[PDB]
Amino acid sequence: DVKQIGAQLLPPLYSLVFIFGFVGNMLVVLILINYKKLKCLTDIYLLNLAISDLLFLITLPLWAHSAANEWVFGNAMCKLFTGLYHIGYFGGIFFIILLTIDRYLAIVHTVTFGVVTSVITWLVAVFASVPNIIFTKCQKEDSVYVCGPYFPRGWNNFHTIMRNILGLVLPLLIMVICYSGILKTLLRMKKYTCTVCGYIYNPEDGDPDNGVNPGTDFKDIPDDWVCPLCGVGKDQFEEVERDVRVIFTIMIVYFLFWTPYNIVILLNTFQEFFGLSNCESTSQLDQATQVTETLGMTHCCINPIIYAFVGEKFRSLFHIALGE
Numbered sequence: 001d002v003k004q005i006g007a008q009l010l011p012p013l014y015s016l017v018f019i020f021g022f023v024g025n026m027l028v029v030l031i032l033i034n035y036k037k038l039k040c041l042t043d044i045y046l047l048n049l050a051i052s053d054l055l056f057l058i059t060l061p062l063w064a065h066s067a068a069n070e071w072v073f074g075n076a077m078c079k080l081f082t083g084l085y086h087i088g089y090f091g092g093i094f095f096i097i098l099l100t101i102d103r104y105l106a107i108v109h110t111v112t113f114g115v116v117t118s119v120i121t122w123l124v125a126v127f128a129s130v131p132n133i134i135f136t137k138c139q140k141e142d143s144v145y146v147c148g149p150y151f152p153r154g155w156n157n158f159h160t161i162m163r164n165i166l167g168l169v170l171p172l173l174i175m176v177i178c179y180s181g182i183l184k185t186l187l188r189m190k191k192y193t194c195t196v197c198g199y200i201y202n203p204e205d206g207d208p209d210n211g212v213n214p215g216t217d218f219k220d221i222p223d224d225w226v227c228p229l230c231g232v233g234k235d236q237f238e239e240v241e242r243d244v245r246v247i248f249t250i251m252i253v254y255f256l257f258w259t260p261y262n263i264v265i266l267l268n269t270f271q272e273f274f275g276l277s278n279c280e281s282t283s284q285l286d287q288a289t290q291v292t293e294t295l296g297m298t299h300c301c302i303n304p305i306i307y308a309f310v311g312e313k314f315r316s317l318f319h320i321a322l323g324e
Protein backbone atom coordinates (compact mmCIF):
# COMPACT_ATOMS: atom_id res chain seq x y z
CA ASP A 1 0.00 0.00 0.00
CA VAL A 2 1.22 3.57 -0.83
CA LYS A 3 -0.15 4.94 2.52
CA GLN A 4 1.71 2.24 4.54
CA ILE A 5 5.04 3.02 2.76
CA GLY A 6 4.34 6.72 3.47
CA ALA A 7 3.86 6.27 7.25
CA GLN A 8 7.16 4.25 7.47
CA LEU A 9 9.42 6.16 4.98
CA LEU A 10 8.40 9.85 5.26
CA PRO A 11 8.80 10.53 9.04
CA PRO A 12 12.56 9.58 9.08
CA LEU A 13 13.22 10.90 5.51
CA TYR A 14 11.64 14.33 6.19
CA SER A 15 13.35 14.55 9.65
CA LEU A 16 16.79 13.91 8.03
CA VAL A 17 16.12 16.40 5.17
CA PHE A 18 14.93 18.91 7.83
CA ILE A 19 18.11 18.46 9.96
CA PHE A 20 20.68 18.29 7.03
CA GLY A 21 18.82 21.09 5.22
CA PHE A 22 18.60 23.32 8.33
CA VAL A 23 22.36 23.01 9.19
CA GLY A 24 23.37 23.34 5.52
CA ASN A 25 21.19 26.37 4.64
CA MET A 26 21.76 28.10 8.02
CA LEU A 27 25.56 27.82 7.34
CA VAL A 28 25.05 29.46 3.88
CA VAL A 29 22.94 32.30 5.43
CA LEU A 30 25.54 33.19 8.10
CA ILE A 31 28.54 32.59 5.69
CA LEU A 32 27.03 35.16 3.26
CA ILE A 33 26.12 37.64 6.06
CA ASN A 34 29.45 37.47 8.00
CA TYR A 35 32.24 36.48 5.53
CA LYS A 36 30.98 37.71 2.11
CA LYS A 37 29.20 40.68 3.90
CA LEU A 38 26.49 40.88 1.10
CA LYS A 39 28.62 43.26 -1.01
CA CYS A 40 27.86 41.54 -4.38
CA LEU A 41 24.45 40.99 -6.05
CA THR A 42 25.06 37.20 -6.32
CA ASP A 43 25.44 37.06 -2.47
CA ILE A 44 22.08 38.85 -1.96
CA TYR A 45 20.22 36.29 -4.17
CA LEU A 46 22.07 33.27 -2.66
CA LEU A 47 20.97 34.56 0.80
CA ASN A 48 17.33 34.82 -0.43
CA LEU A 49 17.63 31.35 -2.06
CA ALA A 50 18.86 29.96 1.33
CA ILE A 51 15.92 31.73 3.09
CA SER A 52 13.51 30.12 0.52
CA ASP A 53 14.89 26.65 1.31
CA LEU A 54 14.63 27.41 5.08
CA LEU A 55 10.95 28.52 4.72
CA PHE A 56 10.30 25.18 2.93
CA LEU A 57 12.36 23.11 5.47
CA ILE A 58 10.52 24.43 8.57
CA THR A 59 7.28 22.79 7.21
CA LEU A 60 8.82 19.24 7.00
CA PRO A 61 8.36 18.46 10.77
CA LEU A 62 4.57 18.94 10.37
CA TRP A 63 4.46 16.88 7.14
CA ALA A 64 6.61 14.19 8.89
CA HIS A 65 3.98 13.98 11.70
CA SER A 66 1.05 13.90 9.20
CA ALA A 67 2.57 10.93 7.27
CA ALA A 68 2.13 8.62 10.35
CA ASN A 69 -0.64 10.52 12.31
CA GLU A 70 -3.73 12.64 11.35
CA TRP A 71 -3.64 16.45 10.89
CA VAL A 72 -3.81 17.53 14.58
CA PHE A 73 -2.65 21.19 14.09
CA GLY A 74 -6.01 22.67 12.92
CA ASN A 75 -7.14 24.65 9.87
CA ALA A 76 -4.98 27.78 10.53
CA MET A 77 -1.74 25.73 10.79
CA CYS A 78 -2.79 23.81 7.65
CA LYS A 79 -3.03 27.15 5.73
CA LEU A 80 0.10 28.72 7.36
CA PHE A 81 2.29 25.70 6.55
CA THR A 82 0.82 25.46 3.01
CA GLY A 83 1.78 29.13 2.55
CA LEU A 84 5.34 28.56 3.85
CA TYR A 85 5.64 25.49 1.53
CA HIS A 86 4.66 27.53 -1.58
CA ILE A 87 6.51 30.77 -0.59
CA GLY A 88 9.61 28.57 -0.11
CA TYR A 89 8.93 26.68 -3.38
CA PHE A 90 8.28 29.76 -5.61
CA GLY A 91 10.91 31.86 -3.80
CA GLY A 92 13.43 29.09 -4.42
CA ILE A 93 12.90 28.86 -8.21
CA PHE A 94 12.52 32.69 -8.66
CA PHE A 95 15.83 33.30 -6.81
CA ILE A 96 17.52 30.65 -9.05
CA ILE A 97 16.04 32.57 -12.10
CA LEU A 98 17.58 35.90 -10.83
CA LEU A 99 20.99 34.23 -10.30
CA THR A 100 20.87 32.90 -13.92
CA ILE A 101 19.85 36.41 -15.20
CA ASP A 102 22.65 38.07 -13.09
CA ARG A 103 25.28 35.74 -14.65
CA TYR A 104 23.76 36.40 -18.12
CA LEU A 105 23.95 40.24 -17.69
CA ALA A 106 27.53 40.07 -16.25
CA ILE A 107 28.87 37.75 -19.02
CA VAL A 108 26.78 38.65 -22.12
CA HIS A 109 26.10 42.40 -21.56
CA THR A 110 24.45 47.59 -6.05
CA VAL A 111 22.70 46.63 -2.72
CA THR A 112 19.59 48.87 -3.44
CA PHE A 113 19.21 46.83 -6.71
CA GLY A 114 19.44 43.54 -4.76
CA VAL A 115 17.01 44.67 -2.02
CA VAL A 116 14.41 45.98 -4.55
CA THR A 117 14.56 42.93 -6.87
CA SER A 118 14.57 40.52 -3.88
CA VAL A 119 11.61 42.15 -2.11
CA ILE A 120 9.65 42.33 -5.44
CA THR A 121 10.48 38.62 -6.00
CA TRP A 122 9.25 37.71 -2.46
CA LEU A 123 6.03 39.63 -3.31
CA VAL A 124 5.49 37.49 -6.47
CA ALA A 125 6.30 34.30 -4.41
CA VAL A 126 3.67 35.34 -1.79
CA PHE A 127 1.11 36.18 -4.57
CA ALA A 128 1.68 32.82 -6.33
CA SER A 129 1.00 31.01 -2.97
CA VAL A 130 -2.43 32.70 -2.23
CA PRO A 131 -4.57 30.14 -4.24
CA ASN A 132 -3.05 27.23 -2.28
CA ILE A 133 -3.52 29.10 1.05
CA ILE A 134 -7.24 29.67 0.05
CA PHE A 135 -8.19 26.14 -1.13
CA THR A 136 -6.01 24.05 1.26
CA LYS A 137 -7.82 23.19 4.54
CA CYS A 138 -8.11 20.65 7.37
CA GLN A 139 -11.00 18.33 6.37
CA LYS A 140 -12.42 14.90 7.34
CA GLU A 141 -11.37 12.49 4.55
CA ASP A 142 -13.34 9.33 5.38
CA SER A 143 -12.02 8.09 8.82
CA VAL A 144 -9.15 10.51 9.20
CA TYR A 145 -8.42 14.25 9.24
CA VAL A 146 -6.20 15.53 6.44
CA CYS A 147 -4.68 18.86 5.52
CA GLY A 148 -5.04 18.84 1.71
CA PRO A 149 -6.27 20.78 -1.34
CA TYR A 150 -10.01 21.28 -2.08
CA PHE A 151 -9.81 23.18 -5.38
CA PRO A 152 -13.01 23.43 -7.50
CA ARG A 153 -12.41 21.80 -10.99
CA GLY A 154 -11.74 25.20 -12.65
CA TRP A 155 -9.19 26.14 -9.98
CA ASN A 156 -7.49 22.71 -10.21
CA ASN A 157 -6.90 23.29 -13.98
CA PHE A 158 -5.61 26.82 -13.17
CA HIS A 159 -3.36 25.71 -10.26
CA THR A 160 -1.80 22.94 -12.40
CA ILE A 161 -1.12 25.07 -15.51
CA MET A 162 0.10 28.07 -13.42
CA ARG A 163 2.43 25.79 -11.39
CA ASN A 164 3.84 24.34 -14.68
CA ILE A 165 4.23 27.87 -16.17
CA LEU A 166 6.09 29.33 -13.13
CA GLY A 167 7.86 26.09 -12.12
CA LEU A 168 8.79 24.51 -15.51
CA VAL A 169 8.11 26.66 -18.65
CA LEU A 170 9.43 30.03 -17.31
CA PRO A 171 12.72 28.67 -15.75
CA LEU A 172 13.38 26.44 -18.82
CA LEU A 173 12.80 29.43 -21.17
CA ILE A 174 15.17 31.56 -18.99
CA MET A 175 17.79 28.74 -19.08
CA VAL A 176 17.61 28.28 -22.91
CA ILE A 177 17.87 32.11 -23.44
CA CYS A 178 20.58 32.81 -20.80
CA TYR A 179 22.88 29.83 -21.41
CA SER A 180 22.64 29.94 -25.24
CA GLY A 181 23.62 33.63 -24.93
CA ILE A 182 26.41 32.84 -22.38
CA LEU A 183 27.73 29.98 -24.59
CA LYS A 184 27.70 32.33 -27.63
CA THR A 185 30.22 34.69 -25.86
CA LEU A 186 32.57 31.73 -25.11
CA LEU A 187 32.69 30.96 -28.94
CA ARG A 188 35.38 33.33 -30.39
CA MET A 189 38.09 33.52 -33.11
CA LYS A 190 41.71 33.15 -31.90
CA LYS A 191 43.69 36.38 -31.30
CA TYR A 192 47.50 36.46 -31.77
CA THR A 193 50.09 38.72 -30.06
CA CYS A 194 53.46 39.99 -31.37
CA THR A 195 56.32 38.46 -29.32
CA VAL A 196 58.50 41.65 -29.79
CA CYS A 197 56.36 44.76 -28.95
CA GLY A 198 53.12 43.13 -27.68
CA TYR A 199 50.62 44.18 -30.44
CA ILE A 200 47.43 42.00 -30.14
CA TYR A 201 45.80 41.07 -33.49
CA ASN A 202 42.02 40.91 -32.83
CA PRO A 203 40.21 39.04 -35.70
CA GLU A 204 36.97 41.02 -34.94
CA ASP A 205 38.72 44.38 -35.62
CA GLY A 206 41.25 42.97 -38.10
CA ASP A 207 43.75 45.49 -39.55
CA PRO A 208 42.05 47.53 -42.36
CA ASP A 209 44.94 50.08 -42.64
CA ASN A 210 47.26 47.32 -44.07
CA GLY A 211 44.75 45.23 -46.13
CA VAL A 212 42.98 42.95 -43.58
CA ASN A 213 39.14 43.19 -43.48
CA PRO A 214 37.47 43.05 -39.98
CA GLY A 215 36.65 39.36 -39.35
CA THR A 216 39.68 37.76 -41.11
CA ASP A 217 41.31 34.67 -39.50
CA PHE A 218 45.03 35.17 -38.64
CA LYS A 219 45.92 32.07 -40.75
CA ASP A 220 44.09 33.56 -43.83
CA ILE A 221 46.33 36.72 -43.77
CA PRO A 222 49.21 36.59 -46.36
CA ASP A 223 52.85 35.83 -45.41
CA ASP A 224 53.88 39.36 -46.63
CA TRP A 225 51.80 40.95 -43.75
CA VAL A 226 53.77 42.61 -40.90
CA CYS A 227 53.11 43.82 -37.33
CA PRO A 228 51.57 47.36 -37.64
CA LEU A 229 53.55 48.68 -34.59
CA CYS A 230 57.12 47.23 -34.92
CA GLY A 231 57.10 45.71 -38.45
CA VAL A 232 58.09 42.07 -37.64
CA GLY A 233 56.74 39.23 -39.80
CA LYS A 234 53.83 36.80 -39.30
CA ASP A 235 56.33 34.10 -38.04
CA GLN A 236 56.91 36.01 -34.71
CA PHE A 237 53.21 35.94 -33.55
CA GLU A 238 52.17 33.74 -30.56
CA GLU A 239 48.54 32.79 -29.77
CA VAL A 240 46.84 34.75 -26.93
CA GLU A 241 45.67 32.63 -23.91
CA ARG A 242 33.56 30.16 -12.60
CA ASP A 243 30.21 31.08 -10.84
CA VAL A 244 28.29 29.72 -13.91
CA ARG A 245 29.00 26.07 -12.82
CA VAL A 246 27.35 26.54 -9.38
CA ILE A 247 24.38 28.61 -10.68
CA PHE A 248 23.91 26.15 -13.65
CA THR A 249 24.00 23.01 -11.38
CA ILE A 250 21.50 24.71 -9.00
CA MET A 251 18.95 25.09 -11.87
CA ILE A 252 19.66 21.59 -13.32
CA VAL A 253 19.28 19.89 -9.92
CA TYR A 254 16.03 21.90 -9.36
CA PHE A 255 14.57 20.48 -12.63
CA LEU A 256 15.64 16.92 -11.71
CA PHE A 257 13.87 17.08 -8.29
CA TRP A 258 10.66 19.03 -9.26
CA THR A 259 9.90 18.35 -12.99
CA PRO A 260 8.55 14.78 -12.34
CA TYR A 261 5.88 16.18 -9.92
CA ASN A 262 4.98 19.12 -12.23
CA ILE A 263 4.43 16.70 -15.19
CA VAL A 264 2.51 14.17 -13.01
CA ILE A 265 0.02 16.86 -11.80
CA LEU A 266 -0.31 18.05 -15.49
CA LEU A 267 -1.07 14.42 -16.57
CA ASN A 268 -3.39 13.79 -13.56
CA THR A 269 -5.34 17.07 -14.10
CA PHE A 270 -5.86 16.91 -17.91
CA GLN A 271 -6.17 13.09 -18.16
CA GLU A 272 -8.76 13.37 -21.04
CA PHE A 273 -6.29 15.51 -23.10
CA PHE A 274 -3.42 12.99 -22.56
CA GLY A 275 -5.73 9.93 -22.90
CA LEU A 276 -5.21 8.65 -19.33
CA SER A 277 -8.91 8.87 -18.23
CA ASN A 278 -9.20 5.08 -17.52
CA CYS A 279 -9.56 3.63 -13.96
CA GLU A 280 -6.10 1.96 -13.72
CA SER A 281 -4.26 5.09 -14.93
CA THR A 282 -5.94 7.46 -12.37
CA SER A 283 -4.76 5.21 -9.49
CA GLN A 284 -1.17 5.14 -10.85
CA LEU A 285 -1.17 8.97 -11.31
CA ASP A 286 -2.45 9.42 -7.68
CA GLN A 287 0.42 7.19 -6.39
CA ALA A 288 2.89 8.97 -8.74
CA THR A 289 1.73 12.41 -7.38
CA GLN A 290 2.56 11.16 -3.85
CA VAL A 291 5.94 9.58 -4.84
CA THR A 292 7.11 12.56 -7.02
CA GLU A 293 6.05 15.06 -4.29
CA THR A 294 8.44 13.31 -1.81
CA LEU A 295 11.30 13.67 -4.38
CA GLY A 296 10.53 17.39 -4.80
CA MET A 297 10.26 17.88 -1.01
CA THR A 298 13.82 16.50 -0.44
CA HIS A 299 15.19 19.32 -2.75
CA CYS A 300 15.20 22.00 0.04
CA CYS A 301 18.43 20.45 1.55
CA ILE A 302 20.37 20.13 -1.80
CA ASN A 303 21.71 23.68 -2.55
CA PRO A 304 24.19 23.60 0.42
CA ILE A 305 25.49 20.20 -0.88
CA ILE A 306 25.97 21.62 -4.47
CA TYR A 307 27.98 24.56 -3.03
CA ALA A 308 30.28 22.16 -1.11
CA PHE A 309 31.02 19.93 -4.16
CA VAL A 310 30.83 22.39 -7.13
CA GLY A 311 32.06 25.52 -5.25
CA GLU A 312 35.76 25.22 -4.23
CA LYS A 313 35.76 28.74 -2.66
CA PHE A 314 32.43 27.87 -0.91
CA ARG A 315 34.17 24.68 0.44
CA SER A 316 36.81 26.90 2.15
CA LEU A 317 34.12 29.16 3.73
CA PHE A 318 32.17 26.08 5.06
CA HIS A 319 35.36 24.78 6.80
CA ILE A 320 35.86 28.29 8.36
CA ALA A 321 32.14 28.52 9.40
CA LEU A 322 32.18 25.06 11.09
CA GLY A 323 35.34 26.01 13.04
CA GLU A 324 33.63 29.18 14.42
Ligand SMILES: CO[C@@H]1COCC[C@@H]1[NH2+][C@@H]1CC[C@@](C(=O)N2CCc3ncc(C(F)(F)F)cc3C2)(C(C)C)C1
Nearest residue numbers: 002005006009063066067082085147148290291293294
Ligand atom coordinates in the same frame (compact mmCIF):
# COMPACT_ATOMS: atom_id res chain seq x y z
C1 LIG B 1 -1.12 20.11 2.69
O1 LIG B 1 -0.56 20.06 1.39
C2 LIG B 1 0.84 20.33 1.32
C3 LIG B 1 1.07 21.81 1.11
O2 LIG B 1 0.44 22.23 -0.12
C4 LIG B 1 0.99 21.55 -1.26
C5 LIG B 1 0.78 20.06 -1.15
C6 LIG B 1 1.39 19.54 0.15
N1 LIG B 1 1.03 18.09 0.30
C7 LIG B 1 1.54 17.36 1.51
C8 LIG B 1 3.05 17.45 1.68
C9 LIG B 1 3.13 16.43 2.82
C10 LIG B 1 2.34 15.20 2.33
C11 LIG B 1 3.23 14.27 1.49
O3 LIG B 1 4.43 14.50 1.46
N2 LIG B 1 2.74 13.25 0.75
C12 LIG B 1 1.35 12.78 0.56
C13 LIG B 1 1.17 11.39 1.16
C14 LIG B 1 2.26 10.46 0.69
N3 LIG B 1 2.03 9.15 0.86
C15 LIG B 1 2.98 8.28 0.47
C16 LIG B 1 4.17 8.68 -0.12
C17 LIG B 1 5.20 7.69 -0.54
F1 LIG B 1 4.68 6.55 -0.97
F2 LIG B 1 5.97 8.11 -1.54
F3 LIG B 1 6.02 7.36 0.45
C18 LIG B 1 4.39 10.04 -0.29
C19 LIG B 1 3.44 10.97 0.11
C20 LIG B 1 3.66 12.46 -0.08
C21 LIG B 1 1.71 14.35 3.55
C22 LIG B 1 2.79 13.62 4.36
C23 LIG B 1 0.83 15.15 4.53
C24 LIG B 1 1.26 15.87 1.45
Ligand SMILES: CCCCCCCC/C=C\CCCCCCCC(=O)O
Nearest residue numbers: 079083122126127129130133134135
Ligand atom coordinates in the same frame (compact mmCIF):
# COMPACT_ATOMS: atom_id res chain seq x y z
C1 LIG C 1 5.73 38.86 4.55
C2 LIG C 1 4.54 37.97 4.84
C3 LIG C 1 3.33 38.26 3.95
C4 LIG C 1 2.16 37.31 4.19
C5 LIG C 1 0.92 37.62 3.36
C6 LIG C 1 -0.07 36.47 3.33
C7 LIG C 1 -1.34 36.72 2.52
C8 LIG C 1 -2.27 35.50 2.38
C9 LIG C 1 -2.72 34.92 3.69
C10 LIG C 1 -3.92 34.51 4.05
C11 LIG C 1 -5.18 34.47 3.22
C12 LIG C 1 -6.46 34.44 4.07
C13 LIG C 1 -7.54 33.48 3.58
C14 LIG C 1 -7.42 32.05 4.11
C15 LIG C 1 -8.71 31.47 4.66
C16 LIG C 1 -9.63 30.85 3.61
C17 LIG C 1 -10.44 31.86 2.81
C18 LIG C 1 -11.80 31.37 2.40
O1 LIG C 1 -11.96 30.52 1.54
O2 LIG C 1 -12.78 31.93 3.07
Ligand SMILES: CCCCCCCC/C=C\CCCCCCCC(=O)O
Nearest residue numbers: 255256259260263276281284285288
Ligand atom coordinates in the same frame (compact mmCIF):
# COMPACT_ATOMS: atom_id res chain seq x y z
C1 LIG D 1 16.56 15.81 -16.27
C2 LIG D 1 15.47 16.83 -16.00
C3 LIG D 1 14.07 16.25 -16.07
C4 LIG D 1 13.69 15.39 -14.87
C5 LIG D 1 13.08 14.04 -15.20
C6 LIG D 1 11.79 14.08 -16.01
C7 LIG D 1 11.30 12.70 -16.42
C8 LIG D 1 10.21 12.13 -15.52
C9 LIG D 1 8.88 12.75 -15.80
C10 LIG D 1 7.69 12.20 -15.61
C11 LIG D 1 7.41 10.83 -15.07
C12 LIG D 1 5.94 10.48 -15.16
C13 LIG D 1 5.57 9.09 -14.66
C14 LIG D 1 4.09 8.90 -14.40
C15 LIG D 1 3.55 7.53 -14.76
C16 LIG D 1 3.04 7.42 -16.20
C17 LIG D 1 1.59 7.85 -16.35
C18 LIG D 1 0.58 6.75 -16.22
O1 LIG D 1 0.35 6.40 -14.98
O2 LIG D 1 0.02 6.24 -17.17
Ligand SMILES: CCCCCCCC/C=C\CCCCCCCC(=O)O
Nearest residue numbers: 001002005009287291292294295298
Ligand atom coordinates in the same frame (compact mmCIF):
# COMPACT_ATOMS: atom_id res chain seq x y z
C1 LIG E 1 18.46 13.49 -1.69
C2 LIG E 1 17.85 12.64 -2.78
C3 LIG E 1 16.65 11.85 -2.30
C4 LIG E 1 16.07 10.90 -3.35
C5 LIG E 1 14.92 10.04 -2.84
C6 LIG E 1 13.64 10.82 -2.55
C7 LIG E 1 12.40 10.27 -3.23
C8 LIG E 1 11.87 8.96 -2.64
C9 LIG E 1 10.38 8.80 -2.77
C10 LIG E 1 9.67 7.68 -2.73
C11 LIG E 1 10.18 6.28 -2.57
C12 LIG E 1 9.39 5.26 -3.40
C13 LIG E 1 8.02 4.88 -2.86
C14 LIG E 1 7.20 4.06 -3.85
C15 LIG E 1 5.77 3.74 -3.42
C16 LIG E 1 5.12 2.67 -4.28
C17 LIG E 1 3.67 2.37 -3.90
C18 LIG E 1 3.24 0.96 -4.19
O1 LIG E 1 3.54 0.36 -5.21
O2 LIG E 1 2.51 0.42 -3.23
Ligand SMILES: [Zn+2]
Nearest residue numbers: 194197227230
Ligand atom coordinates in the same frame (compact mmCIF):
# COMPACT_ATOMS: atom_id res chain seq x y z
ZN1 LIG F 1 55.11 44.03 -33.15
